[PDB]
């Protein structure tokens, strides 16, 4: 009862329940569609008009559903058709994926150890910053050798050259984290007086605030059930209805050039296939509008970090705030009618040629 929760903050369930994917999947869809509508309405565009100004759309994990949905949109009358399809895909992903891999209580000894070692509350997705994919894949290979098949972890998101996410059982990832906490040097270690090549590699690892292992073998059983639920509730995405390119999160190809079902591919990209974020963002653009949730903690700022010095300006479309560095934009930059609306980020090759 989201309307009840929004009217009365007292009657809103606890964060753990909200975070569970049967709730969080469709509601993150709704947040993104809501930001898209606020954007379109304050510009006096129809959804299709705002869509027509876009060279392309894509999304990170379940964002890819919202990206295909807004790619289909034309008028305010038929917008709720696209909203329904998106909400329905995300409902069945949330529900089926939760049924395939429900969260269970984690041993309190594991929780106590993770909190005393300034790691997160364990979760099915661990983010590793400042290690290469090869390095992370070596540590997951070591962990996976000992573990049996149904407990094995895998690289789920390649967000950047040194920004990786590992999915699998929270206990299996706590196991990976024990292996990592040996290999990592203390944060307040001075290595300035050590030769560069002899330094102990320092990196970050935190559990993500998520409740399901997206992009993992654990959720693969849910695939067939989600596909059947979509054919039952009459949710398809036709290439000819998708007016802008929508980039696949695995190979960065346009979803419109698929032979098979786009809905089946999108489901596959969310539940099974890893997100290769630098591969999917290979498109040429001066501006990137980040509708997704998280404001400055969202996909926009991640994408900025990957694209810094190529002449791409990210705008965080969902948050009004002030960036002191002014290296990416907020909401106000979309609507500004003065020169402040058209800020270009530096391309170093051109600027210092």
């Amino acid at each position: 009862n989201i309307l009840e929760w929004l009217e009365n903050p007292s009657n809103t369930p606890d964060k753990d329940y909200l975070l569970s994917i049967p709730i969080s999947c469709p509601l993150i869809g709704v947040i993104q569609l809501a930001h898209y509508v606020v954007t379109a309405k304050l510009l006096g565009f129809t959804p299709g008009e705002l869509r027509s100004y876009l060279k392309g759309a894509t999304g990170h994990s379940q964002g890819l559903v919202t990206a295909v949905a807004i790619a289909e949109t034309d008028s305010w009358e038929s917008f709720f058709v696209s909203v329904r399809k998106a909400i329905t895909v995300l409902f069945f992903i949330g529900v089926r994926c939760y049924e395939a891999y429900p969260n269970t209580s984690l041993p309190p000894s594991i929780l106590e150890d993770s909190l005393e070692n300034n790691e997160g509350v364990p979760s099915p997705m661990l983010s590793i910053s400042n290690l290469t994919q090869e390095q992370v894949q070596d540590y997951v290979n070591k962990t996976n050798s000992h573990l049996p098949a149904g407990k094995q972890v895998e690289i789920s998101l390649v967000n950047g050259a040194k920004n990786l996410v590992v999915s699998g059982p929270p206990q299996s990832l706590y196991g990976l984290n024990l292996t990592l906490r040996k290999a990592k040097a203390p944060s307040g270690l001075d290595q300035s007086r050590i030769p560069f090549s002899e330094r102990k590699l320092k990196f970050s690892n935190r559990f993500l605030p998520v409740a399901s292992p997206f992009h993992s073998h654990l959720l693969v059983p849910a695939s067939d059930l989600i596909n059947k639920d979509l054919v039952k509730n009459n949710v398809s995405f036709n290439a000819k209805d998708i007016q802008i390119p929508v980039y696949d999160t695995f190979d960065g190809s346009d979803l419109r050039v698929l032979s098979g079902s786009i809905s089946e591919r999108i489901v596959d990209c969310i539940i099974r296939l890893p997100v290769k974020w630098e591969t999917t963002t290979q498109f040429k653009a001066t501006h990137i509008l980040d509708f997704g949730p998280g404001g400055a903690s969202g996909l926009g700022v991640l994408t900025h970090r990957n694209k810094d010095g190529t002449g791409v300006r990210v705008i965080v479309a969902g948050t009004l705030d002030i960036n002191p560095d002014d290296d990416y934009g907020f909401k106000q930059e979309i609507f500004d009618v003065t020169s402040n609306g058209l800020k270009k980020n530096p391309n170093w090759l051109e600027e210092y040629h």
Binding site: P102, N103, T104, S105, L106, P107, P108, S109, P148, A149, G150, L218, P221
Partner: protein
């Protein structure tokens, strides 16, 4: 939706019927309780009177339809066994049950490549119909609307694995006790869940019919009495026991003097009235403690009386014996957690999964009629809910660890109550932790108390061998612990009485020499024991008995044991002393309830003897110290000694990683074997302790000094053996190592015979070791020692259950098993005629 709950009308002219309707039923059809009232308008002040005739029957008929899926028949005997129908545990029932009680433990959740368990709480679902049928017989006449559930408890049968999805579980229930108390009738029910014929767990439920009951002919009480122990010290104690008719030895001429007896009695009682019994039966085995601390049956208690005010058997045993308490309290309770939980807004989900369709939990009208504060939470919901917390916190979410759980339903809970459960570790019972919990409501009122028995983490005991001994070892424990005192005192007495020395004196004072005097009658008896101490060898089918202590004859007045530094270092004293310190430590742990029933164990060398006496009780204390004293003497005889008691033999711990990073255990094996062959002296790798970090070389003190100097030279030259033997030259390394060995051997041979072994870079000498333990030098000792072991290890004391899978021998580093494969592997390691004969003839032993 809106449904009829009550229908009030006139049945006949004068009979008011209030039909109470339950809509939440087994088959969906509503069930109606007709409450009947007389209307007598001649009594204007109170014209309505309840029809009390058949009222408990009418209530039972309703509850029967709601709870039991059988024909309504209250004419069965409360003494008879109740047979519940077979129950198949499905994933769907486990899912529904765990959600209903808020149990999020992963063992109960479907996961890939992994079998789904049922929680032990699931036992009430399987057993409810059998268990609850016990409060229904005609002779157990009570008002089910006033039924209180006092207590519930689960107990896993030792060895039994937890319930799983797929398991077909059969249930039996028996009424243990039904007794009329001043305030109501208590019914104590015991359910037994079985799977594949074998019993898995016992469910204990206590129910209370609030009321005034005086039908004492239908009451009875079975009590399992606490185990009583008597130490029979005097002949007066024996006479007092023989004066009791109930005390009935199997063998009347059995010798009770100095024996410890245990009485394991059960009391069956029938009542004439509240205070006087109409019958008393007290029966059960009387057991004597054997020297191994095993108890065996020597007779029965068999008491049978009519009208009585008491049980004289138990009164006697209380006054004269001591109570054996399985539960042992910790010094201080260890707080585990203070946990918040909630009762659900509705009791229908729990009602559906449990089959407990009691209207008082779901129907406002029944709860009102029953005078309750509202539609109270199922006590069994609160049980399962607090048990899920215990399982999570106390058992670290390993559901298999929870072996028993009992809860006392102290007070009723309303839906949407916030409960606070304090969980504490308060004691031990048989290796299991004893967890106490107390659940309070928002008003700080105790609603639920109980306890759980949680298996300790998987444990191994490892028993140290020789080298570890020091003066005073175990003497702090000996002061404090009664268990440790009994071990030491029994061994000290055996040594004093048999060999004329105190093992305690040697541990405490570590004398350099010890003279044994053979004066007087006692001295001649002790001298005989030293003389009768013989090696029993078989040579050409002939018994050739040799003497240990050659210098002791019938004209000897004394014998002096000799040492350089102290006799605690001499192996015939070290062995008993270490074995006792270890057995005393272990007996203290056992006394405190700290030993898991399924612990594994191994001992390093001598440690193996303490381990076997400790965990398996294969030998008595006396047998143990005798066996290891002999073992030590066998080793002392095998080794030449000087006047001061010094040998030309020793041991070095070699770290192959401390010489060179490329120097492996195959390189060490090679070097040691070459230093042995070149010099002709004794040196072998005997203890494999830490892979690539600690190997022990035993033998000739010169060979050990040579090996130390060779490895010191190899470390300083930084020269590899394996790289040269494979990539440079074939068998040249052998010749090259010979001259390095010769350099060290020439310097070692010059040194005097009692040469002090020096600490190398890759070698450290083992202090207080003078025998080449575990070398082939001691192989002559095996046959006499084997014959001695065969005499002193009695086969009746070998409990396979206490060894099988648990004991890891040093010889065959594999968990002990009585299989052809195990025997064959032992034969391959050490060829022996008895084992070969067992392997060949294995088929006749199987049948």
């Amino acid at each position: 939706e809106l449904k009829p709950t009550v229908i009030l009308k006139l049945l006949k002219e004068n009979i008011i019927q209030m039909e109470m309707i339950e809509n939440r039923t087994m088959d969906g059809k509503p069930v109606s309780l007709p409450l009947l009232y007389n209307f007598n308008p001649d009594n204007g002040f109170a014209p309505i009177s309840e029809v009390m005739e058949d009222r408990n029957q009418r209530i039972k008929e309703m509850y029967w339809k709601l709870w039991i899926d059988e024909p309504f028949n209250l004419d069965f005997d409360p003494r008879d066994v109740i047979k519940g129908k077979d129950f198949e545990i499905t994933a769907k029932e486990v899912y529904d049950f765990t959600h209903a009680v808020g149990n999020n433990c992963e063992d109960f959740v479907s996961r890939p490549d992994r079998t789904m368990l049922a929680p032990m709480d699931f036992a009430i679902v399987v057993g409810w119909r059998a268990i609850i049928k016990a409060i229904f017989p005609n002779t157990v006449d009570g008002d089910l609307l006033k039924l209180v559930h006092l207590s519930n408890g689960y107990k896993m049968i030792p060895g039994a694995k937890p319930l799983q999805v797929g398991d077909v579980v059969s249930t039996t229930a028996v009424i243990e006790s039904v007794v009329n108390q001043p305030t109501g009738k208590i019914v104590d029910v015991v359910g037994t869940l079985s799977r594949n014929g074998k019993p898995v767990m016992e469910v204990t439920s206590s129910f209370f019919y609030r009321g005034n009951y005086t039908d004492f002919e239908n009451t009875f009480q079975k009590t399992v009495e606490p185990v009583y122990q008597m130490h029979i010290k005097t002949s007066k104690d024996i006479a007092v026991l023989r004066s009791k008719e109930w005390f009935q030895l199997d063998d009347e001429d059995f010798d009770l003097l100095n024996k410890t007896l245990t009485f394991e009695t059960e009391t069956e009682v029938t009542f004439k009235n509240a205070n006087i019994f109409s019958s008393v039966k007290c029966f059960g085995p009387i057991k004597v403690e054997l020297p191994t601390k095993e108890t065996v049956e020597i007779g029965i208690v068999d008491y049978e009386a009519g009208a009585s005010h008491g049980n004289p058997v138990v009164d006697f045993l209380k006054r004269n014996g001591s109570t054996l308490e399985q539960k042992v309290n910790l010094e201080n309770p260890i707080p585990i957690a203070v946990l918040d939980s909630y009762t659900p807004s509705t009791n229908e989900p729990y009602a559906r999964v449990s089959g407990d369709l009691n209207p008082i939990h779901v129907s406002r009208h029944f709860a009102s009629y029953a005078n309750l504060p509202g539609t109270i939470t199922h006590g069994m919901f609160s049980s399962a809910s607090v048990r899920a917390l215990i399982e999570n916190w106390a058992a670290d979410s390993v559901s298999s660890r929870v072996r028993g759980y009992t809860c006392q339903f102290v007070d009723m809970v309303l839906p949407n109550t916030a409960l606070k459960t304090s969980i504490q570790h308060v004691g031990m019972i048989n290796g299991r932790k004893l967890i106490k919990f107390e659940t309070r409501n928002e008003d700080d009122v105790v609603v639920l108390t109980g306890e759980a028995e949680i298996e300790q983490p998987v444990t191994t005991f490892v028993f140290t061998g020789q080298g570890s001994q020091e003066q005073g070892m175990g003497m702090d424990l000996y002061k404090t612990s009664k268990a440790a005192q009994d071990v030491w005192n029994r061994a000290d007495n055996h040594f004093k009485d048999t060999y004329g020395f105190s093992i305690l004196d040697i541990v405490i004072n570590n004398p350099v020499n010890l003279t044994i005097h053979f004066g007087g009658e006692k001295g001649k008896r002790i001298r005989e024991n030293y003389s009768a101490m013989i090696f029993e060898t078989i040579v050409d089918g002939k018994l050739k008995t040799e003497k240990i202590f050659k210098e002791i004859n019938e004209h000897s007045t004394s014998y002096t044991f000799r040492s350089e530094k102290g006799l605690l270092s001499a192996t015939q004293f070290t062995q008993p002393a270490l074995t006792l310190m270890e057995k005393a430590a272990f007996e203290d742990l056992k006394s405190k309830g700290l030993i898991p029933a399924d612990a594994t164990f191994a001992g390093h060398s001598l440690g193996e003897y303490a381990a076997l006496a400790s965990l398996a009780d294969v030998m008595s204390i006396e047998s143990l110290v005798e066996v290891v004293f002999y073992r030590g003497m066998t080793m002392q005889v095998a080794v030449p000694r000087d006047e001061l008691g010094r040998s030309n033999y020793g041991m070095i711990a070699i770290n192959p990683g401390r010489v060179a990073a490329s120097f492996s255990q195959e390189a060490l094996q090679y070097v040691v074997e070459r230093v042995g062959k070149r010099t002709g002296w004794l040196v072998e790798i005997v203890n494999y302790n830490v892979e690539n970090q600690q190997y022990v070389a035993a033998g000739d003190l010169r060979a050990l000094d040579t090996v130390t100097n060779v490895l010191n030279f190899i470390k300083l030259q930084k020269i590899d053996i394996i790289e040269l033997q494979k990539s440079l030259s074939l068998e040249e390394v052998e010749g090259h190592l010979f001259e390095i060995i010769d350099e060290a051997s020439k310097k070692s041979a010059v040194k005097p015979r009692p040469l002090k072994l020096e600490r190398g870079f890759a070698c450290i000498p083992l202090v207080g070791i003078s025998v080449p333990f575990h070398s082939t030098y001691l192989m002559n000792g095996v046959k006499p020692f084997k014959s001695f072991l065969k005499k002193n290890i009695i086969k009746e004391n070998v409990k396979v259950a206490r060894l099988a899978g648990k004991y890891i021998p040093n010889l065959t580093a594999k968990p002990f098993q009585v299989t052809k494969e195990y025997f064959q592997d032992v034969y391959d390691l050490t060829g022996s005629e008895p084992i070969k004969e067992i392997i060949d003839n294995w088929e006749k032993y199987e049948q």
